[PDB]
Design a protein around this ligand. Structure first.
Ligand SMILES: Nc1nc2c(ncn2[C@@H]2O[C@H](COP(=O)(O)OP(=O)(O)OP(=O)(O)O)[C@@H](O)[C@H]2O)c(=O)[nH]1
Ligand SMILES: Nc1nc2c(ncn2[C@@H]2O[C@H](COP(=O)(O)OP(=O)(O)OP(=O)(O)O)[C@@H](O)[C@H]2O)c(=O)[nH]1
Ligand SMILES: CCOCc1ccc(C)c(Nc2ncc(-c3ccc(N4CCNC4=O)cc3)o2)c1
Ligand SMILES: CCOCc1ccc(C)c(Nc2ncc(-c3ccc(N4CCNC4=O)cc3)o2)c1
Ligand SMILES: Nc1nc2c(ncn2[C@@H]2O[C@H](COP(=O)(O)OP(=O)(O)O)[C@@H](O)[C@H]2O)c(=O)[nH]1
Ligand SMILES: Nc1nc2c(ncn2[C@@H]2O[C@H](COP(=O)(O)OP(=O)(O)O)[C@@H](O)[C@H]2O)c(=O)[nH]1
Ligand SMILES: [Mg+2]
Ligand SMILES: [Mg+2]
Lengths: 431, 431, 116, 430, 427
């Protein structure tokens, strides 16, 4: 279990995907040309997980860039680290998806999917031990949501033995006025419940609220939201990228975090929450770091964890700190908040500590929780879905691509089942 | 003559094996290159025409990174490359992958390497198997290996050193599932098993060695002292010796009742300087103190079925007999009514060896008691309870069923554990 | 009354009366030899039955070991067969679900052409 | 009737066997090299009974050393008189018996028995007139008990015309090595009742009690126990080793001591009981010697003689003493304790007197009694056996070797019959 | 000329034989090398070689070699031809059945051949004198086998026994009562006259009359040899009473089964006192303290009485001594026998072994009386037999050697009939 193949689909997927590669390249000492100019030998130990080594001692991201319109991928190419990517790995259409899930999944995207699979196949074959795939995308658009879930289905068919992991951005009316986002999200969730092993739920509702309320940005932009996403993505992949006691791999994460196959949607959390390109004048203590990452204000999904129970938790502390103090604080949190952790899953909170802190922070903490409170996110999308579907609003956009109203009813039904399953385990008792 | 083959499976088995063979080398004056500038040590070491002393051991793991440290470490020259066997990817903490999916790919190779060692024996006594209960490899692969060893070597004695899981140092949430599954499968193939509770060792390191947060190296060094005491009777020619056959006949009254409780004394910090040397009576009395046990349980509220005292160092039979005579007159140590003369004593003149740069203090005399007590059924009760909490909701079961296991194997294994706990109740009942 | 005075060179004798008055062996030895020989024969035959029991014990130990190996070989063959059947079925069901998705997607694309 | 072939099996057998040869070699003036450096012509008169004469005028014990593990015999070889033994007579395996009677009798020991018989045959053929065999072994282990009784069986088959005599050490929880000792002992007694002519019952329970109570040794060791055993073995074989009025042989002993074939287990006794190394500051008188030898405290089998009756007795006094006084005291003992001797065996007490005393004593007395009180020893093993067998405890170690539970039931049954046979003659009247 | 062949069986027979032949040599002036520098009467017991050597007409037999080996290497080793001393490899282990059936069968033909060689040198063989113990396995078992074979090979010849009756004070085996009854039963119809010697009587005579605190077999045998010599003196010198073996039967045995005379000897004086008269030594013949078998003739009846004198004795003194005994003592004869005595006098005085315990005397007497009181000795032995046999104690040792349990009861029934015979004759 070593190599991971990264895929980024649609506008959102490519935007957060580019930011991910910019962040981890900096951490690993990789410059925009692909040359290593770092100092620590630990930066290169597990570099092969995300980078291929090319001639001239260059490091090239094992990334595949996908979009049904050339626009975003021209912006990526022109970006800061745009020249680091393998030019043959840019697979794009011309048509666009027009925020239509049916266009991305059944028509325009289905014509491009085979071209993408050729690049996936080429990357996968160059892996000594492929762990799996990591996809970045939004669920509200048409390419990331529609074509992204079509890609997952196709990859699953060809590599049923590998792990499928996604960073899925959930839509919010606060951030986007495109009315069909609840349709695209419900249709996508329907696919994710069946075809992914683990999904990180990145809610734009939560990211907007953090920017607006906590960071006091009156008018948050996507650049501001993406700073929180790139912070989360760096944190949740630290264990994969750096040597540690936890011999971290994608399968072991699924095995220990997912007690029931469909309940694989994680609520990520981060501490400290910081604003873009801003200097942090103070270091956060271990008790502060611990309190903050378990607080509702620090969750990347707009769900109050105190409204549910944690099935399983994985914490990662970064920076030079007392491991004795981390252990004491984590024990304290569990003892004081015992009613928020299911009693029937013994030893359900795991903690890891990495010496390397992220850029701009002397210490930080990332949280990955499998909480039954995530049903609040799906209920929100479901309510928005019903409001539109009861009137058959904008439905001609989807039926015009060949879809049937039956598929909408089934996707809504499956998401309603997902909600009631989270509720079942929320209510479950040890006795 | 009278050879013993050690098999170290998975991370815990391998890492404990490193600590044991390092200690054996120091005890016998064998250098890391195999050069030795009694002859009883030949039971554990073969000799080459170049005068090199090679361990009669096999190290197996489904992932290469632990055994790779042995291959590049201080004792790399000690082992023949063919004794160190590794796969490509581990069992991902899943019993089903260690037993079927991944394990099936390396089992034949392991048996062939064991056959090569067995062919060099002119009177093989049996096998010593080191493994964890919690690991996917330690649990799954060990079960598969034990079943195959019973086919290839019939009724040849097989002894285990099993690491029982503890929350303080756990690695996976599904450890109770792996523990019950391996215990069920291995039960009819094991002749005698020495369980080591990681919590008991952790507590001993914190209390007796003043280590605030013990590491696996700390735990393994203490474990190796106990394993060394058990095997010293095979590696040295002392005043009173105990062969593998003498352990089994004296400790196991019923085939299923084969789990002795190990107790060791004295465990003293190297940093203590005024403690005068402890007498045979003092160290013998310490064997009946719960603070010195390898498994957390209460023998005072249980019955003894067998008692074996393994002394090492400056010990004379006159002092041992006096110490045992006072133990016989203690009402607080109750034997079952069907066991008239419950004691087996062994004495090895060679004093306890301590690793340079270690935590333990050097002592004139030490003892390891192996007692068969009904109180050990407390360890099964605690593990079975953790299993029941998860299994009642079928949490994580899909990971095992996905690998070809049937849900029926869980209840079959659990029913066997319920029968085992019932067996310990029945052996304690008066006639 | 003293009567019958007898004399010789080494001495003399007389009487003084105070008052007057008023194959078969061979047969027994051979019959005893047959009894000793019979007793010994029966004792050595008793010892021959002991040697027969000793053979039966060491051979029973071999037969139990063979049966232990045989049952463990069958049990293992059973476990690995049931596991292969189950893995084959789990993967077969997964591929069938994905074949159904491909059939549905073609229907969607066919339906799109009809809407023109 | 001259030569005796000695055999010592297992750890206990080889430990007491080595002590026996050390003791009698000293008495006969034989040093650890095998050379005679004594003074008395009487030391050599009957030395052919236990020793072969080798080139260089050397004396070599007619002893065969057996064990299923090399350990004990390496310790014998390294011992004080270890070099006196014939190196070709050390017959050992590598496996060990693991205190399992079934391993010694049926599996591991059965693979070594033919190698032992080859050495026995070689020694037997060099005898002008072989009288029989003498085996030293314990009944609680696996080699001495399991293989020792297998050897007895094989020897009886090849030499049915010779006497089989044993020094059998009985187990006790007071001095124990294994929990399965009662199983091993019952299975061995079952063999001894059928295949030996005379067995000297040396009870570890009695030896421990003598060391603890009489000799005041708070923690008795095997070395302390073996001092009493070597003293007994020297005494019991004095008549065979030295010239005397009693033309002592193994067959005549059995003929006069054993009225019923199965009742051939003797209760040995010794006086004065002395501790290892410590010097007896006073000489014991003939009346004191007589009183002590008949005292239960001086018996080597943990049985009270006053709880039974003597079928027959053989007493041997050693040292320069009044034979008139010995006769008077022996008669007095019989007249005063008439209720402890069966009335239906006339003149059942024989006394012998040897001028040569043992080392360290000016006078001593050894006693050999065939008492019905020995049933107490067998009842003790039987109780310990039942306590385990009722729960089938540790049985899988024996059935694993091919044994059946039937064999345990039969051995227990035969020992229970032996007990009722002793009781029958204890109740018998004139 | 009429020859006598002596047969010494087992340890007791052999060792007594040594004492007898040593005494005979001293009485006849024969040296240990066989030379006699000198009366043809001694030729009844000694043959002569062409070298002038006088050789005993005797055979020594034992199933084990160590007793006869002492004769082979002793003072009198030159006296006997090697063929006269016969030994086996292993003894009868105090077992009649082992001596008679198992071990005895292996040497019987050889013994008979050596006896036949001696018999061929006789121009008028009288018969045999057999010395043996009742208690030994050889003395009991082998003797009874030999007596049966001698009756087949030598029909009309007399066979006299000198049997050692067992005593607890000097016993060697617990089963001696079994061996005694078994041999007595088997030998009864083959013996013409048997002189029993109770070891307890000889032991007590040595303690009381010779002041020996603890008598040895040498002490016992030297006294026994004096009595045997007194009995056989008439056969070795020109005597007049008991001049041939048949005369013992004639003078002492009225009924074939009742053939056990009681011997009494006087005087027995310590070598460490004016000479005793004919009256004094004659009066000592009727004292139980001087008997060879412990019993009370005063409460029994006599059938025959023979007085054998040696030394300075004249008929006038003997007749006077008997006359006073008649008037002072109550000595009761059976109503069918005359109350009287056959008297023999041999002018040759008793010879004593140099370095012995006995004092040399001017005159001595040995009385041989056939009294019913001797049935007390049988009663004592039969009682000991009954005590053991009731429980079948030690019987397996005999049955193991091929003997049947029925032989025990057949032998015991014969003893019960013998005791009944003494009662019928003495009532
Ligand atoms: N005492 C001790 N316990 C250990 C050690 N390594 C792991 N463990 C324990 O063993 C259990 C985990 O099993 P592992 O041996 O690490 O894993 P494995 O056998 O290699 O199996 P997989 O990696 O899942 O395929 C937990 O209870 C750990 O705390 C070690 O060196 N010593
Ligand atoms: N008077 C006398 N009695 C003897 C002599 N030797 C042995 N006895 C007695 O004879 C009886 C035993 O018979 P033994 O003559 O010793 O034995 P055995 O006839 O040679 O036969 P085995 O039993 O085969 O040795 C006992 O009562 C002895 O006391 C001896 O020289 N003189
Ligand atoms: C705890 C650090 O987790 C961050 C993290 C992020 C991403 C990945 C792929 C990993 N990988 C991973 N390998 C092993 C584990 C792992 C995670 C959690 C646990 N669990 C959760 C409940 N109780 C446990 O022991 C046990 C093992 O997680 C780990
Ligand atoms: C007399 C004490 O001797 C002890 C002793 C020890 C060892 C041996 C082999 C012997 N051998 C031996 N040969 C003959 C006898 C012998 C022993 C006992 C008796 N007994 C005891 C019961 N009544 C007897 O006359 C009679 C004879 O004993 C004798
Ligand atoms: N956080 C975040 N959300 C984005 C970004 N760009 C677009 N989105 C969201 O993505 C959804 C629309 O999908 P989009 O990726 O633009 O279209 P696609 O190209 O058809 O996949 C809406 O919910 C937007 O708010 C971005 O850079 N960051
Ligand atoms: N008296 C005595 N008993 C011993 C000695 N050594 C062992 N034993 C006893 O022998 C029994 C065990 O048998 P052992 O001879 O050691 O084992 P084996 O080698 O399998 O025959 C137990 O009853 C021990 O107490 C010894 O030297 N003296
Ligand atoms: Mg591992
Ligand atoms: Mg004899």
């Amino acid at each position: 279990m070593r190599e991971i193949v990264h895929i980024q689909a649609g506008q959102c997927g490519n935007q957060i995907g580019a930011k991910f590669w910019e962040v981890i390249s900096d951490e690993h000492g990789i410059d925009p040309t692909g040359s290593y100019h770092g100092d620590s030998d630990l930066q290169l130990e597990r570099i092969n997980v995300y980078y291929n080594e090319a001639t001239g001692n260059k490091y090239v991201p094992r990334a595949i860039l996908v979009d049904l319109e050339p626009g975003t991928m021209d912006s990526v190419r022109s970006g800061p680290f745009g020249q680091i990517f393998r030019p043959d790995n840019f697979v794009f259409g011309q048509s666009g998806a027009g925020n239509n899930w049916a266009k991305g999944h059944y028509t325009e995207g289905a014509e491009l999917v085979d071209s993408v699979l050729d690049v996936v196949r080429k990357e996968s074959e160059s892996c000594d031990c492929l762990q799996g795939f990591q996809l970045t995308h939004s669920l509200g658009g048409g390419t990331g949501s529609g074509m992204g879930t079509l890609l997952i289905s196709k990859i699953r068919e060809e590599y049923p033995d590998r792990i499928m992991n996604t960073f899925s951005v959930m839509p919010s009316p606060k951030v986007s006025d495109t009315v069909v986002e609840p349709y695209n999200a419900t249709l996508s969730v329907h696919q994710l419940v069946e075809n992914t092993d683990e999904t990180y739920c990145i809610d734009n509702e939560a990211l907007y609220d953090i920017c607006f309320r906590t960071l006091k940005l009156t008018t948050p932009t996507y650049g501001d939201l993406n700073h929180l996403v790139s912070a989360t993505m760096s944190g949740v992949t630290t264990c994969l990228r750096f040597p540690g006691q936890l011999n971290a791999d994608l399968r072991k994460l699924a095995v220990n975090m997912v007690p029931f196959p469909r309940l694989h949607f994680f609520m990520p959390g981060f501490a400290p929450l910081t604003s873009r390109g801003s200097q942090q004048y103070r270091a956060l203590t271990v008790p502060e770091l611990t309190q903050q990452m378990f607080d509702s204000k620090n969750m990347m999904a707009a769900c109050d964890p105190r409204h549910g129970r944690y099935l399983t938790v994985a914490a990662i502390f970064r920076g030079r700190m007392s491991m004795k103090e981390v252990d004491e604080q984590m024990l304290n949190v569990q003892n004081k908040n015992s009613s928020y952790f299911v009693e029937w899953i013994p030893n359900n909170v795991k903690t890891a500590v990495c010496d390397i802190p992220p850029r701009g922070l002397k210490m930080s903490a990332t949280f990955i929780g499998n909480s039954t409170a995530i049903q609040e996110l799906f209920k929100r999308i479901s309510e928005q879905f019903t409001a539109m579907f009861r009137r058959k609003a904008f439905l001609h956009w989807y039926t015009g691509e060949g879809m049937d109203e039956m598929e909408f009813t089934e996707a809504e039904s499956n998401m309603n089942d997902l909600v009631s399953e989270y509720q079942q385990y929320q209510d479950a008792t040890a006795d | 003559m009278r050879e013993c083959i050690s098999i170290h499976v998975g991370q815990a088995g391998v890492q404990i094996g490193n600590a044991c063979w390092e200690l054996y080398c120091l005890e016998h004056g064998i250098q890391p290159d195999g050069q030795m500038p009694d002859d009883s040590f030949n039971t554990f070491f073969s000799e080459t025409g170049a005068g090199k002393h090679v361990p009669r051991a096999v190290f197996v793991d489904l992932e290469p990174t632990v055994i790779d440290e042995v291959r590049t470490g201080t004792y790399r020259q000690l082992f023949h490359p063919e004794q160190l066997i590794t796969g490509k990817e581990d069992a991902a903490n899943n019993y089903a992958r260690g037993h079927y999916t991944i394990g099936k790919e390396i089992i034949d190779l392991v048996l062939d390497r064991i056959r090569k060692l067995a062919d060099q024996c002119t009177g093989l006594q049996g096998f010593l198997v080191f493994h964890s209960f919690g690991g996917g490899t330690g649990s799954g692969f060990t079960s598969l290996l034990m079943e195959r060893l019973s086919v290839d070597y019939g009724k040849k004695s097989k002894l285990e050193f099993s690491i029982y899981p503890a929350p303080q140092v756990s690695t996976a949430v599904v450890e109770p599932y792996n523990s019950i599954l391996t215990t069920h499968t291995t039960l009819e193939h094991s002749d005698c098993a020495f369980m080591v509770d990681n919590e008991a060792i952790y507590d001993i390191c914190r209390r007796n060695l003043d280590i605030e947060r013990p590491t696996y190296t700390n735990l393994n060094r203490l474990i190796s002292q106990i394993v060394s005491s058990i095997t010293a009777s095979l590696r040295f020619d002392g005043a009173l010796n105990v062969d593998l056959t003498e352990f089994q006949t004296n400790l196991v009254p019923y085939p299923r009742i084969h789990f002795p409780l190990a107790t060791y004394a004295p465990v003293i910090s190297a940093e203590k300087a005024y403690h005068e040397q402890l007498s045979v009576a003092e160290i013998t009395n310490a064997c009946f103190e719960p603070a010195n046990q390898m498994v957390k349980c209460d023998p005072r509220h249980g019955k003894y079925m067998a008692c074996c005292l393994l002394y090492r160092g400056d010990v004379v039979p006159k002092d041992v007999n006096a110490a045992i005579a006072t133990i016989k007159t203690k009402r607080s140590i109750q034997f079952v009514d069907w066991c008239p003369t419950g004691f087996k004593v062994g004495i090895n003149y060679q004093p306890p060896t301590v690793v340079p740069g270690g935590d333990l203090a050097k002592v004139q005399r030490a003892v390891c008691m192996l007692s068969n007590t009904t109180a050990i059924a407390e360890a099964w009760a605690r593990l079975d309870h953790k299993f029941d909490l998860m299994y009642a909701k079928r949490a994580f079961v899909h990971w095992y069923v996905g690998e070809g296991m049937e849900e029926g194997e869980f209840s079959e294994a659990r029913e066997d554990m319920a029968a085992l706990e019932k067996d310990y109740e029945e052996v304690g009942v008066d006639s | 009354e003293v009567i019958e005075l007898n004399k010789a060179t080494s001495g003399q004798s007389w009487e003084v009366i105070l008052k007057p008055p008023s194959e078969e062996i061979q047969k027994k030895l051979e019959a005893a030899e047959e009894r000793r020989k019979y007793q010994e024969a029966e004792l050595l035959k008793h010892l021959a039955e002991k040697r027969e029991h000793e053979r039966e014990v060491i051979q029973k130990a071999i037969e139990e070991n063979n049966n232990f190996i045989k049952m463990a070989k069958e049990k293992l063959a059973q476990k690995m067969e049931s596991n292969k059947e189950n893995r084959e079925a789990h993967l077969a069901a997964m591929l069938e679900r994905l074949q159904e998705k491909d059939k549905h997607a073609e229907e969607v694309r066919k339906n799109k052409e009809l809407k023109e």
